[PDB]
Design a protein around this ligand. Structure first.
Ligand code: SF4
Lengths: 801, 1154
DNA sequence: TCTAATGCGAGCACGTGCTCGCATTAGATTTTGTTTT
């Protein structure tokens, strides 16, 4: 069908098409799937997308655009089952955070109204169908309920409009099949009630028989024309006055075809029945021997020319073998040339390559391949140069030019013009550390994120960021209640930790990811898992509080925007101001001989610590930014000029210790406690280490990544650095932000991903289909980042200074 | 019977021997296929008492082998037919061969299912599901089962979940369920094997550790490491005897050794070992001061002693950190969790089978199990035993237990007198991960004798007819020191060694080469490979054609690079393609990371639901539209909050037609809307093709770098859509969901050039059964995959299910004894398989070998190899072979004793090697612009006239290719959705009554004018003849029937020379008479009546039209063209002429003439 | 996810020197694939 349509060859297929693609049959089947599966997402929108449910005399292009946004909504909110048949309106809110609660924007009300309107015209006919279907017992009243479902939705009128449109565009054969489909369905129902109309039947069996009957439905054979290529079989197909005959699929197992015996009677059954005196149909060996007569009739039919062809490989690439007939013909005609059929013209003669150019489409198709082959140092045939010149000599040449533009195609990225970038990003870039890191990893990823604002399809699925937000807000709530009851983390008992954490998660659950934790029993148990995690974390924070000299100042402290702290500000060459707002997880203060000390703690779901290489390449700029702001504003916000004590990561989890020793309960508790030993960076001195772990007298610490010798000096295993390194790192962070913001305003949006430690940011990115990155394609390569040691990094930052 | 004809005695035995089950150990290069064929031919083409082909059963691994079997048998039948042309039997076997039972075991099982569907609960029209389709069904029933279990909320279930899941989700448990179920499907009784899980955990304190099954592996492991600690210390003691060696420290050694021996004394007593092993300490090393010693050897002895320390500490942490009683208690505490797990898995199995039956669907596992259920021996089994006189099984070393239980069932007679003929080779069994059992082969090997005395026959084929002496010598030399014991599972001796049988003109460059690279590593690797290949091509290497005895210069076809894994393949392909080396390789994954596939899928997504910003942006930026970054951002500028699609529509709604970006988005928009409407009426495949032609994206990617591949990637997406149409039928909705669900669980498809002069880069596993003059095996300096032995649980064929001791409340976990046992067992089994992989790797060649690996430091690793190569006996130390994690760790030490790189015969073996210590540093237009411009190229081309003639050509008779041949009167003149029967009132419609009267008019006697009584009589007879329906007969007007025969035309009808009615006619009309522009088309109809008088020929037609003067002119034109077509038919066909036409109307009894 | 290098103190051998024993982080590295119509 597709090849002859593409090669402009009129044909007559001696076969009847199936109705399984017709909107009417799909409408019926998927409807019964809605009823059987209790309104599953798939069945519902299969039912809707057949457009037979669409409002009468309404713009199809508008209704579709409404259904689509309803679909996306149903996906994001996991709408299924009785939720469709409930009286409750589908509530919509574009953005909800579990740390607050707003009121619906007029936009959201408009959207929600549209959604509920769409639902309100989709549900009723489908609902009423379920009403009658449950109540209907016998087959007749079920078929009656189905037909009523067809008539209430004005299906005949919509089919009539469709066939009229088909006639109007000239697709008259397509127009006829609508009326054919309706007649088919009606006949099916009639026969059904004729044979079992009074019999009481189940919904499953009714659907089974409807499905079975629908599978058999056939469109009436398209009548033969005055001049067509007759394509048919070798068994029942008849011919007359045939000049040229093409024989297809001369493969082993195909021709002669191995006869499938299966039925009620096997070959041995029929054979023995034949010896008894009962004559039924033929056997396997008989119909296998008849194959030669069939091949004979097919071979003897053409008056002028006979073509016997066979493929050597199937659709997938599996080897297909020539038939016994091919070898037989090689015997009868020993010096007859075998002709090669290929879509690779360079494998046949120029005279055969000339046969390819039969029309404009296929000529363009092949000559584009030939031109690419030509670019690969191959002296392609001149016929394609001739056809090329013809394709550029007639009117429709821009189409061909566009097609041939692939010859010099590279995944290039044009730099954003100043006016375009200024309008897109804005006059003032109000961003965050996350955005800057996103740009640093890949400029194009930033262009698709904070530029084009492309949003991936939202699913009713609990992801890691959602869980992280749950943890953050939970600890926040617990902290607030702690200061409310004049309690401190030190004074928390096991019972109190459990109740506090459990209730906190209980409070945050109905606003986390469209209420997913309340949607199923499985997610209920997930909620309990999360409650256990927050519980243990609470206990660890308690123990840490009782062994640290650092007191938490502001938890979830935001800078910029509405936050207490002012935003860090940057000036650019383009004139655009660049301010970064963000939310520091935790800041701790501590008094010492060196004065005031400030440290920053961030709650991570991962254990891995800060990598100076990642900081150098601007991939990890969160902590040092938070520290920089906390130190620079320590006077106007807190008290006096403080000193960077360090940056710390806290691993929120519920660990399972894997000890090879029979441990006691106390030893187990200690082994659990040791799993929460914070990673990050510290200040290279004894006093700070003793302030972060007041229990540590000599040896290693179970809270911080540092140790002590007999002297009092920290060991080399300690992840600590001098104040020089800290200030140097912060300056490096500032320079990264400045340069990044500069390149952003300049319009740099090139595709430049990195590859460090066999890791690519492309794996976590959703813009893979947008960037269309191709490493084989030149000008498109990763950025190899040497993973050097910390001292080498700091030496680089020093040489840059 | 004995006879001679170019066969060997062993091959001869494999051909003629009959009367019992025969096992043929065919080595690599042996003519197993030729022997198998000949054996069949003799039975098929015998003179005394021949048997038909359909009385045999040939089971193969791949369909390629079955097809090859069929063709070689066919050729032999052809030869026999040349020698005896007259024979009906021999001719008949050639006809039967198409119906022969040469299949795979799966195909045979399918045949059984199709034949005996009624024995089990199966649908006769069942469909074998896609792997992805079935797995999606499994995923669904898993989620449903889990949800139900969470709903019940039983304590046992939660206990299971808390142990085998993370702290955030329960995925790992469901993966565990899937794994256990799959692993259970490899036993002839999955439920029983699952219910045997608890027997491993059914222990107490009073249980003897040494009496339990799994301890078999715990025992040997200790016996191994202790013997590995003794030898490691003996070598230290010997090193004290060396002149530069330290003499005093031998005291410490003499102490340590004494301690280890003390442990070896109590190896069988686990309880005693718990008391002794943790108490063992190595005394402080006696420092040796002086320059009379040797710093290298001094520091080496300490390394050896610390090696013993490492081994001992490893042994202690493995077994003796808790008492055997505590071990037993831990193992006993885990039992209920195991019971819950088993019942859960069983529930999943029943739910999965029920789900599959609901959709008339089976797996590939179901293919074996349903077949086995049928055969159980039952009537079917007895029939198949009756039918098959012999059963031939190839690649028997890769048969599983279910397949075996089917084979032993379809074969007739006990093992002593069975007909099961089986051929294979354990040394080539590289599929254990697919859960096949080579032990099934080996057990029958040992069970059988070289004779057929009261048992099965074993036959050994040793001669290698297809490979050079150097290859066989190298292979035998290497695997003589590697295969054997617990690492080889098979003793490598004579009658197992490869023997030369290939006549070869000797070459000097055929020696096995080893290229060791110092320091991507794959970059240096591939570059070294490229250099050797280029040297082999540049300087003429002669490949010998054994069949025609002629040397030919080596092609790229004769060079193949074999890898253990395929992630290294792309880089090697890139480097070799850069060097100028043609390379082809097949991929089983990475289809959805191809950009063209991503773009095409993005298009399908937008056609499904346009409100997806990412697939939309993908299509817009793709060559399909060609929008750049400025244009894309320009689209966003129009609307910043709304979806990207809305922003596009808004730009279209605000833009001017003079903009190029407008043209882009508009043309795409029209295309999009067309596709939206097109997808609703056509299948997915049709939509893909239509997109491909409307975008010319396939044509486009065909003209960009690697377009050959890219067009294929787009081709197989169409073919895959057609494939999916069987799974759950058509629809972009269904298709895209299926693809999305396939990817989200991590499933992939292949990127699916077999012509000469291409270098094939492929897996060693896939090279099985193939052969090449030159073989490259790289990645030999790369670690094996030991990821299987890390998780908290493990699955075993014998021991069943092992797992860590996990306590959810106490947050503690530690490995249980049977787990560690299984780890040791699975490791040495894995190592065996790997060694066999290396075997097929080396035996896939015919001329030359290329061993290539990498390392860090040459000299130190060479010393590391020398450490292992110190033993006098052939076989390398079993512990040192166990400690291997790299292929080099196998090859190296075996090569260290050799003369080229250790006295006695090992040095004199006829194997030749060439070692290269390579280092990383040593490896270190007018027409174009014409096409870019859009301008034609200048020049005189020979096909210019032809091409321009053909592109301008139009079919002469195009205007009639769409014109229907057969037409109708109503249709020519021209040139309602009905209700169901059970919804309307009882019959009696216009068409019914009209036709009912028409029947009377065409059946009423025209002899004379009938009265009312005669008319009623005719009607009654038509009622009894069943010519009239009773409802048609009940409803009839009697007046008009009388009225017609009282008319003038009626009277002329009664009185006529000749009369005829209902005369079917077909008329050929020139195309022009109906169609305006520019060959006869057919026009058929039925003339109601014709009658001839003395005046002429008159035509008559009946009409039941609604009437009751002014209606006559309308009725005249209503049937004008019809009457003209009737008259034209009579006048043209009958060559006569019609004088006057008449139409009678029932409603009133009116007649009008034309 | 398990394997190799690092830090520092303790006690044992010939008060000082040196080897061991412990505890940790980083750290490097990294699959195999028939089978049906
Ligand atoms: S995928 Fe990799 S390359 Fe494509 S955008 Fe995201 S990061 Fe840049």
């Amino acid at each position: 069908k597709e090849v002859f349509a593409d090669y402009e060859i009129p044909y007559f297929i001696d076969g009847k098409a199936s109705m399984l693609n017709h909107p009417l049959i799909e409408f019926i089947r998927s409807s019964l799937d809605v009823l059987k599966g209790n309104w599953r997402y798939e069945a519902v929108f299969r039912c809707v997308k057949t457009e037979l449910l669409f409002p009468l005399n309404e713009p199809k292009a508008k209704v579709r655009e409404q259904v689509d946004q309803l679909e996306n909504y149903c996906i994001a909110y996991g709408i299924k089952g009785d939720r469709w048949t409930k009286g409750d309106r589908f509530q919509y809110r574009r953005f909800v955070s579990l740390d607050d609660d707003f009121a619906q924007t007029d936009q959201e009300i408009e959207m929600e109204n549209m959604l509920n309107d769409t639902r309100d015209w989709i549900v009723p006919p489908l609902f009423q169908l379920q009403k009658r279907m449950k109540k209907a017992k016998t087959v007749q009243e079920k078929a009656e309920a189905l037909y009523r479902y067809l008539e209430e939705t004005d299906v005949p009128l919509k089919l009539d409009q469709e066939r009229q449109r088909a006639e109007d565009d000239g697709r008259i054969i397509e127009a006829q099949q609508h009326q054919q489909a309706w007649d088919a369905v009606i006949q099916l129902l009639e026969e059904f009630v004729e044979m079992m109309g009074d019999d009481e039947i189940s919904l499953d069996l009714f659907q089974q028989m409807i499905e079975a009957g629908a599978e058999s439905l056939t469109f009436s054979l398209i009548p033969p024309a005055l001049d067509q290529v007759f394509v048919g079989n070798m068994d029942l197909s008849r011919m007359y006055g045939t000049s040229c005959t093409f024989v297809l699929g001369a493969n082993d197992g195909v021709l002669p075809a191995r006869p499938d015996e299966n039925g009620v009677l096997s070959d041995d059954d029929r054979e023995w029945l034949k010896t008894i005196g009962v004559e039924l149909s033929s056997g396997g060996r008989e119909r296998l021997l008849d194959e030669h007569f069939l091949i004979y009739m097919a071979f003897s039919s053409p008056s002028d020319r006979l073509y016997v062809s066979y493929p050597i490989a199937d659709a997938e690439g599996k080897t297909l073998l020539p038939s016994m007939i091919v070898k037989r013909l090689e015997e009868l005609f020993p010096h007859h040339k075998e002709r090669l059929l290929t879509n690779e013209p360079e494998q046949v003669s120029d005279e055969e390559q000339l046969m390819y150019v039969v029309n404009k489409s296929v000529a363009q198709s092949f000559t584009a391949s030939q031109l690419r082959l030509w670019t690969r140092e191959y002296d392609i045939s001149d016929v394609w140069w001739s056809t090329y010149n013809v394709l550029m000599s007639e009117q429709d040449r821009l189409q061909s030019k566009k097609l041939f533009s692939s010859l010099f195609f590279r995944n290039e990225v044009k730099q954003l013009e100043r006016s375009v970038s200024r309008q897109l990003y804005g006059e003032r870039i109000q961003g965050s550390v996350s955005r800057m890191e996103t740009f640093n990893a890949c400029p194009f990823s930033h262009f698709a994120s904070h530029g084009l604002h492309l949003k991936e399809r939202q699913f009713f699925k609990l992801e890691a960021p959602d869980i992280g937000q749950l943890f953050h807000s939970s600890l926040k709530l617990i902290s607030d209640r702690l200061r409310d009851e004049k309690l401190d983390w030190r004074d928390l008992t096991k019972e109190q930790c459990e109740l506090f954490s459990y209730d906190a998660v209980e409070r945050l659950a109905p606003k986390l990811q469209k209420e997913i934790l309340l949607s199923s029993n499985r997610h209920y148990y997930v909620k309990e898992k999360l409650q256990k995690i927050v519980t243990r974390v609470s206990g660890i924070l308690s123990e840490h509080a009782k062994a640290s000299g650092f007191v938490p100042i502001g938890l979830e402290l935001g800078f910029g925007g509405k936050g207490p702290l002012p935003p860090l500000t940057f000036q650019l060459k383009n004139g655009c101001t660049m301010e970064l707002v963000g939310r520091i997880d935790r800041v701790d203060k501590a008094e010492s001989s060196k004065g005031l000390l400030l440290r920053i703690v961030a709650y991570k779901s991962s254990d891995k610590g800060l990598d100076l290489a990642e900081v150098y390449y601007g991939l990890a700029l969160q902590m040092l930014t938070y520290l920089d702001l906390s130190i620079t504003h320590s006077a106007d916000w807190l008290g006096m000029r403080a000193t960077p004590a360090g940056v710390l990561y806290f691993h929120i989890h519920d660990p399972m210790i894997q000890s090879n020793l029979p441990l006691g309960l106390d030893e187990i508790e200690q082994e659990i406690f040791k799993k929460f030993k914070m990673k990050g960076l510290l200040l290279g001195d004894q006093e700070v280490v003793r302030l972060m772990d007041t229990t540590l007298q000599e040896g290693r610490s179970n809270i911080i990544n540092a140790g002590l010798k007999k002297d009092g000096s920290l060991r080399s295993d300690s992840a600590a650095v001098g104040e020089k390194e800290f200030d140097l790192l912060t300056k490096h962070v500032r320079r990264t932000f400045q340069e990044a913001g500069e390149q952003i305003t300049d319009g740099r949006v090139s595709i430049e991903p990195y590859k460090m430690k066999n890791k690519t940011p492309c794996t976590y990115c959703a813009f893979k289909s947008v960037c269309q990155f191709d490493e084989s394609l030149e000008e498109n390569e990763y950025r190899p980042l040497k993973a050097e040691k910390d001292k080498t990094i700091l030496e680089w930052i020093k040489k840059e200074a | 019977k004995p006879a001679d004809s170019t066969w060997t005695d062993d091959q001869w035995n494999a051909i003629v021997s009959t009367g019992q089950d025969i096992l043929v150990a065919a080595a690599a290069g042996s003519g197993k296929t030729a022997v198998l064929v000949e054996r069949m031919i003799r039975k098929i083409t015998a003179e005394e008492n021949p048997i038909d082909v359909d009385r045999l059963l040939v089971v193969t691994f791949t369909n390629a082998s079955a097809a090859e079997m069929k063709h070689r048998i066919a050729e032999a039948l052809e030869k026999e037919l040349v020698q005896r042309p007259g024979s009906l039997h021999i001719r008949r076997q050639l006809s039967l061969l198409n119906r022969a039972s040469i299949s795979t075991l799966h195909s045979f099982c399918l045949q059984v299912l199709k034949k005996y569907y009624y024995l089990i609960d199966l649908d006769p029209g069942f469909r074998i599901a896609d792997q992805t389709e079935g797995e999606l069904i499994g995923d669904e029933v898993l989620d449903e089962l889990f949800e139900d279990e969470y709903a019940k909320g039983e304590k046992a279930f939660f206990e299971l979940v808390d142990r085998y899941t993370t702290d955030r989700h329960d995925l790992d448990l469901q993966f565990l369920v899937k794994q256990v179920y799959e692993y259970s499907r490899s036993h002839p009784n999955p439920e029983a094997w699952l219910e045997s899980f608890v027997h491993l955990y059914d222990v107490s304190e009073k249980s003897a550790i040494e009496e339990l099954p799994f301890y078999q592996y715990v025992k040997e492991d200790i016996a191994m490491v202790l013997n590995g600690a003794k030898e490691k210390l003996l070598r230290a003691l010997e090193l004290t005897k060396a002149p530069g060696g330290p003499a005093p420290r031998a005291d410490n050694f003499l102490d340590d050794l004494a301690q280890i021996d003390e442990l070896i004394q109590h190896q069988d007593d686990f309880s005693e070992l718990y008391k002794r092993v943790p108490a063992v300490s190595f005394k402080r090393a006696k420092a040796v001061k002086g320059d009379e010693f040797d710093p290298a050897l001094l520091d080496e002895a300490t390394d050896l002693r610390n090696g013993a320390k490492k081994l001992l500490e490893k042994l202690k942490t493995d077994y003796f950190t808790r008492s055997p009683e505590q071990h037993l208690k831990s193992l006993a505490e885990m039992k209920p969790v195991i019971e819950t797990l088993v019942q859960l898995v069983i529930s999943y199995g029943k739910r999965f089978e029920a789900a599959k039956q609901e959709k008339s669907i089976i797996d590939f596992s179901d293919l074996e199990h349903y077949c086995l259920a049928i055969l159980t021996p039952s009537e079917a089994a007895r029939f198949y035993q009756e039918q098959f006189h012999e059963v031939l099984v190839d690649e028997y070393q890769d048969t599983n237990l279910v397949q075996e239980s089917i084979l032993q069932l379809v074969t007739s007679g006990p093992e002593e007198t069975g007909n099961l003929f089986m051929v294979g080779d354990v040394k080539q069994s590289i599929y254990r991960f697919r859960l096949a059992e080579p032990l099934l082969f080996l057990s029958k090997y040992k069970r059988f004798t070289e004779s057929g005395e009261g048992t099965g026959r074993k036959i050994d084929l040793n001669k290698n007819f297809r490979s050079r002496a150097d290859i066989l010598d190298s292979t035998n030399f290497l695997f003589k020191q590697l295969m054997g014991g617990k690492i080889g599972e098979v003793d490598y001796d004579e009658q197992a060694e490869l023997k030369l049988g290939a006549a070869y003109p000797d070459n000097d460059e055929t020696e096995t080469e080893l290229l060791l690279i110092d320091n991507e590593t794959v970059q240096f690797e591939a570059k070294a490979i490229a250099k050797e290949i280029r040297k082999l091509i540049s300087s003429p290497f002669k490949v010998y054609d054994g069949k025609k005895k002629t040397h030919r210069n080596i092609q790229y076809r004769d060079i193949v690079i074999l890898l253990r894994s395929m992630p290294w393949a792309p880089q090697i392909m890139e480097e070799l393609r850069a060097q100028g080396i043609p390379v082809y390789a097949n991929l089983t994954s990475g289809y959805f990371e191809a950009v063209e596939v991503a773009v095409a899928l993005s298009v399908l997504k937008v056609i499904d639901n346009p409100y997806q910003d990412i697939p939309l942006a993908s299509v817009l930026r793709s060559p399909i539209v060609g929008a750049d970054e400025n244009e894309l951002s320009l689209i966003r500028l129009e609307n910043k909050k709304a979806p990207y699609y809305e922003a596009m529509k808004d730009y279209l709604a605000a833009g001017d037609r003079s903009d190029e970006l407008y043209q882009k988005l508009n043309t795409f928009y029209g295309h999009l809307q067309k596709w939206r409407a097109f997808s609703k009426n056509h299948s997915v495949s049709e939509l893909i093709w239509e997109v491909y032609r409307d975008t010319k994206y396939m044509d486009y990617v065909g003209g960009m770098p690697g377009g050959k591949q890219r067009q294929a990637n787009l081709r197989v997406l169409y073919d895959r859509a057609r494939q999916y149409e069987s799974t759950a039928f058509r629809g972009l909705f269904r298709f895209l969901r299926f693809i999305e669900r396939m990817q989200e669980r991590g499933d992939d498809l292949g990127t699916a050039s077999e012509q000469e002069d291409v270098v094939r880069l492929m897996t060693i596993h896939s090279s099985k059964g193939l052969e090449f003059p030159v073989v490259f095996v790289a990645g030999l300096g790369r670690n094996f995959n030991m990821m299987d032995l890390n998780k908290s649980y493990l699955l075993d064929k014998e021991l069943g299910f092992g797992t860590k001791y996990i306590h959810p409340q106490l947050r503690i976990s530690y490995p249980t004894l049977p787990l560690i046992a299984m780890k040791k067992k699975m490791r040495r089994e894995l190592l065996s398989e790997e060694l066999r992989v290396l075997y097929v790797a080396l035996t896939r060649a015919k001329e030359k070998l290329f061993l290539i690996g990498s390392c860090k430091d040459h000299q130190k690793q060479l010393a590391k190899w020398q450490a292992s190569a110190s033993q006098t006996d052939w076989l390398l130390p079993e512990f040192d072979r166990y400690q291997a994690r790299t292929y080099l760790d196998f090859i190296g030490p075996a090569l260290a004793r050799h003369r080229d790189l250790a006295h006695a015969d090992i040095s004199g073996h006829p194997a030749r090697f060439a070692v290269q210590m390579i280092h990383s540093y040593d490896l270190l237009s007018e027409r174009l612009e014409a096409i870019r411009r859009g301008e034609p190229v200048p020049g005189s081309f020979a096909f210019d006239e032809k091409a321009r003639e053909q592109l301008s050509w139009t079919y002469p008779h195009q205007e009639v290719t769409q014109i229907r041949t057969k037409q109708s009167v109503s249709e020519i003149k021209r040139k309602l959705y009905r209700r169901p029967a059970f919804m309307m009132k009882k019959g009696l419609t216009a068409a019914e009554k009209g036709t009912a009267m028409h029947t009377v008019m065409q059946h009423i006697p025209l002899s004379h004018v009938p009265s009312i009584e005669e008319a009623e009589q005719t009607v009654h007879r038509l009622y009894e003849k069943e010519l009239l329906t009773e409802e048609q007969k009940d409803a009839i007007d009697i007046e008009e029937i009388v009225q017609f025969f009282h008319t003038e035309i009626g009277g002329q009808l009664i009185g006529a020379k000749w009369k005829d009615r209902e005369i079917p006619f077909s008329l050929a009309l020139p195309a022009k008479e109906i169609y305006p522009d520019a060959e006869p088309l057919l026009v058929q109809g039925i003339i109601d009546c014709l009658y001839e008088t003395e005046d002429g020929l008159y035509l008559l037609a009946y009409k039941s039209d609604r009437i009751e003067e002014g209606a006559a002119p309308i009725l005249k034109k209503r049937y004008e063209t019809q009457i003209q077509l009737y008259t034209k038919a009579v006048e043209q066909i009958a060559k006569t002429k019609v004088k006057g036409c008449a139409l009678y109307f029932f409603d009133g009894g009116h007649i009008l003439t034309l």
